[PDB]
């Protein structure tokens, strides 16, 4: 009765091609600017901008029709690169969109109501392994193609020509060049500009594509002044650029933060200077009097050119990556946030905002997970320094070779994310770096985003030396599982080169929400329980046995345990009972368990399963000594002690499995675990890997890593479901892509999470007059 069904949405899937872009955004509007056609990795979303909802999705698994283009195993780099508005084949005749992914697969997708099940899966001849773009105007569409050196691609401008041979589009081969380090297209597409690197120095060209009009090249050594002839490469290096639609103005945003403006005929130099970090986002208006700029500071800054001044937008809560205006009269700013508070994933954030009061309409998220390391081609953006958030200019080949060969020669690849599920409304919390993301996966979006520290997350853009002021990372938060409290615990760091910079220090607090609001109010905080400088790593919440989920027992890596129960005579949270066995050793590989009726407390220390009672906080030493065994000892270093119900149990160590019965105080069964995992985990991570059902056990997940023919970029989910304390392998669900965690949603189902972040689940005459008046309505 169980089966794989991958359901919910994932990443926005932009042009994740380092310098192979000038736009890196094809989230288009209709020509009636009311609905937003945005691609994903998992869907196509059509949004009503007047309500910020989805009027129609085109999911990437519901049709084999489309997903023959992308449902394969290792070639899942089928990313989506261009959207046009009308039928390309027929001349302008009604409104259904066309779609190109990275392989030149022409798709003609339906746009209104319900789709017709014949998408014209057209394909041009040469588009075998490429698509940079096509560029659009009336009639003529001109494809930018890439062939193969010094790590420079070759860009060619061919034309889609299609007049009467109704089953073949043929290219027309206008332009050729073989050297690109950075390129860009205009906001109307009628002009582009690239660089060439061709030594007596590097050079920059600006070319037309729809005529013979303006085709020129010039070395940028003239644009580089004597100050940047002298000083370092962060001043010599172009970070971003922009061109005008007219063809008389070229912005070059240099990596220091200066924004040069050069002309076309006379080639003057003109300098714009406010940005302190590097600049990544440069675009002109359609009239070319305002220059939109977004850098690593959290501000959206737009320059009026004929005053050379600026209007700000202070707190975008992230890092701006690309921005332009795209209204035909120029009323809508499309842009990409990134918010690199987690360096693991390139988790962007698509949004547009009005030009009226700069209010944001339809912040389009993906699910933003909290991994442990970089995933699969996760490069870092170009800053001036090799900071903790990104690498510098000189470490491009260095960091890409380091990450690629690290994933080749590594053996430690867990990145197991911790989440939670809310028993009020069944949305899943991604506890972010010093924050949360409450994702309601029923319609694959968010609801809010609360900050969870009193740090420097919000009120300051992180600049070149403040980037190493990382924010206090939270580890986890516990729901009171009536859905009432976020009991969060977080670790915090100081800036380095300080005597108090040694320790990473700890703080917990308590959050209450009503069912009305989506935020949480802070009830109380507790700064370093169990004394100072002690981790509080494993805390367990309680069922409705004691006071309708008021029990939360805090633990330690040292092995101390305290009990914590809410009360109302003291309108506050406080503790109940105290224990700190101060071992002079420590071990952060600790699990815990607790009985669902409230009887047994299980401390799974470093290979000793000590047993306390509930009532008196101590080791149960009764008055009989007839198999009242209140201390187990397991085979090796364990990571989980899990109780599925009050009779039997699963403990998990590094090498094998074991099952325990406690009414019948013995061991039961065993499965192998080291034939599955080699060295993949860090200690304590099997706890957040597997999570029990209320009835039907748990799903131990096989961690695999598919070898080359070192691991290649094929991956696994061959998950085998277990029922009722290690009894049946009743389903081996096969899948070609990775996994991080599996949780239980309360309809006896098991939601799993992909790294390519797709959430899924294994679970259970007057009529003619009326019609013609409906046609005459508009």
């Amino acid at each position: 009765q169980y089966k794989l069904s991958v359901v919910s949405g994932g990443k926005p899937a932009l042009n994740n091609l380092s310098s192979v872009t000038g736009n890196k955004n094809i989230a288009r509007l209709s020509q009636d600017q009311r609905n937003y056609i945005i691609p994903f990795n998992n869907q196509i979303k059509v949004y009503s901008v007047e309500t910020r909802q989805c009027v129609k999705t085109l999911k990437f698994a519901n049709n084999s029709l489309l997903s023959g283009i992308f449902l394969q195993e290792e070639e899942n780099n089928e990313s989506i690169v261009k959207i046009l508005l009308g039928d390309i084949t027929v001349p302008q005749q009604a409104h259904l969109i066309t779609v190109f992914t990275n392989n030149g697969h022409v798709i003609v997708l339906n746009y209104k109501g319900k789709l017709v099940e014949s998408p014209k899966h057209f394909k041009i001849s040469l588009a075998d392994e490429k698509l940079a773009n096509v560029f659009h105007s009336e009639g003529n569409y001109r494809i930018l193609t890439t062939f193969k050196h010094n790590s420079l691609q070759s860009y060619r401008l061919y034309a889609l020509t299609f007049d009467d041979a109704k089953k073949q589009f043929e290219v027309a081969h206008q332009a050729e060049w073989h050297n690109v380090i950075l390129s860009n297209i205009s906001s109307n597409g009628k002009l582009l500009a690239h660089m060439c690197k061709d030594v007596e120095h590097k050079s920059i060209s600006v070319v037309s594509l729809f005529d013979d009009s303006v085709n020129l090249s010039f070395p940028l050594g003239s644009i580089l002044s004597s100050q940047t002839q002298s000083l370092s490469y962060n001043t010599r290096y172009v970070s971003s650029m922009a061109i005008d639609n007219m063809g008389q103005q070229l912005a070059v945003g240099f990596a220091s933060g200066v924004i040069s403006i050069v002309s076309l005929a006379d080639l003057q130099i003109r300098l714009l200077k406010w940005h302190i970090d590097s600049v990544l986002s440069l675009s002109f208006s359609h009239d070319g009097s305002y220059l939109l700029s977004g850098g690593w500071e959290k501000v959206m800054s737009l320059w009026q050119l004929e005053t050379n001044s600026q209007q700000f937008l202070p707190r975008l809560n992230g890092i701006i990556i690309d921005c332009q205006v795209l209204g035909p009269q120029g009323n809508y700013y499309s842009l990409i946030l990134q918010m690199t508070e987690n360096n693991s994933n390139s988790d962007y954030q698509f949004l547009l905002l009005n030009a009226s009061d700069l209010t944001s309409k339809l912040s389009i998220n993906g699910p933003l997970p909290v991994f442990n390391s970089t995933i699969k081609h996760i490069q870092q953006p170009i800053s001036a320094m090799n900071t903790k958030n990104s690498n510098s200019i000189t470490s491009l080949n260095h960091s890409k070779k380091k990450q690629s060969r690290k994933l080749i020669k590594s053996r430690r690849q867990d990145f197991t994310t911790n989440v939670e599920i809310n028993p009020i409304n069944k949305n899943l919390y991604f506890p972010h770096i010093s924050a949360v993301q409450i994702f309601d996966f029923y319609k694959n979006e968010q609801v809010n985003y609360q900050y969870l520290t009193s740090g420097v997350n919000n009120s300051m853009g992180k600049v070149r030396f403040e980037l190493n002021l990382q924010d206090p990372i939270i580890t986890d938060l516990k729901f009171t599982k009536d859905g009432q409290w976020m009991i969060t615990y977080e670790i915090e760091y100081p800036p380095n080169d300080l005597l108090s910079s040694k320790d990473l220090t700890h703080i917990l607090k308590f959050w209450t929400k009503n069912d009305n609001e989506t935020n949480w109010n802070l009830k109380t905080k507790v700064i370093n329980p169990h004394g100072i400088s002690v981790p509080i790593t494993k805390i367990l919440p309680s069922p409705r046995s004691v006071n309708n989920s008021q029990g939360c027992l805090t633990a330690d890596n040292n092995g101390g345990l305290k009990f914590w129960s809410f009360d109302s005579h003291e309108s506050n949270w406080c503790l109940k009972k105290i224990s700190l066995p101060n071992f002079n050793h420590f071990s952060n590989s600790v699990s815990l368990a607790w009985s669902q009726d409230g009887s047994l407390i299980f401390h799974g220390f470093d290979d000793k399963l000590q047993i306390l009672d509930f009532d008196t906080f101590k080791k149960f030493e009764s008055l009989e000594n007839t198999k009242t065994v209140s201390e187990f000892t397991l085979d090796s270093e364990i990571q989980t002690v899990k109780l599925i119900n009050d009779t039997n149990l699963i403990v998990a160590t590094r090498t094998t499995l074991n099952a325990i019965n406690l009414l019948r105080g013995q061991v039961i069964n065993s499965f192998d675990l080291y034939p599955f995992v080699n060295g993949v985990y860090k200690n304590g991570h099997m706890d957040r890997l597997i999570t029990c059902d209320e009835r039907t056990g748990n799903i131990a997940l096989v961690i695999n890593q598919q070898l080359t023919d070192v691991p290649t970029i094929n991956y696994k989910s061959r998950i085998i479901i277990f029922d009722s304390d290690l009894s049946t392998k009743l389903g081996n669900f096969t899948h070609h892509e990775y996994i991080s965690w599996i949780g239980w949603n309360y309809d006896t189902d098991f939601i799993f999470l992909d790294i390519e972040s797709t959430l899924g689940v294994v679970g259970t005459n007057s009529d003619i007059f009326a019609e013609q008046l409906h046609k005459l309505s508009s």
């Binding site: 008389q248 006379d266 003057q268 003109r270 050119l305 005053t307 050379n308 001044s309």
Partner: protein, 86 residues
């Protein structure tokens, strides 16, 4: 600081720039008025340009460059051009 460009006939303002952050005291130009360089007590000398065909058709000036290479103040500038020096 408000460097304001007025038109001669019609006696009207033409442009304004509040880029100087102190009291402007001096400013000069060249022969056919392709540039104007200003300075005052913000110890900053900065430029305005009118060189390109768009600037000379629309008669428009852009705050092209800015430069601080001083210690306290400016109280005088002047400029010279030749075919042997500029």
């Amino acid at each position: 600081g408000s460097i304001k460009f007025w038109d001669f006939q019609f006696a009207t303002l033409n442009q304004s720039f509040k880029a100087h952050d102190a009291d402007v005291l001096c400013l000069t130009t060249d022969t056919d008025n392709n540039y104007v360089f200003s300075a005052g007590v913000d110890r900053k000398i900065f430029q305005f340009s009118q060189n390109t065909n768009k600037s000379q058709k629309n008669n428009r000036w852009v705050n092209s460059s800015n430069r601080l290479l001083h210690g306290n103040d400016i109280r005088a500038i002047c400029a010279y051009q030749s075919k042997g020096a500029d």
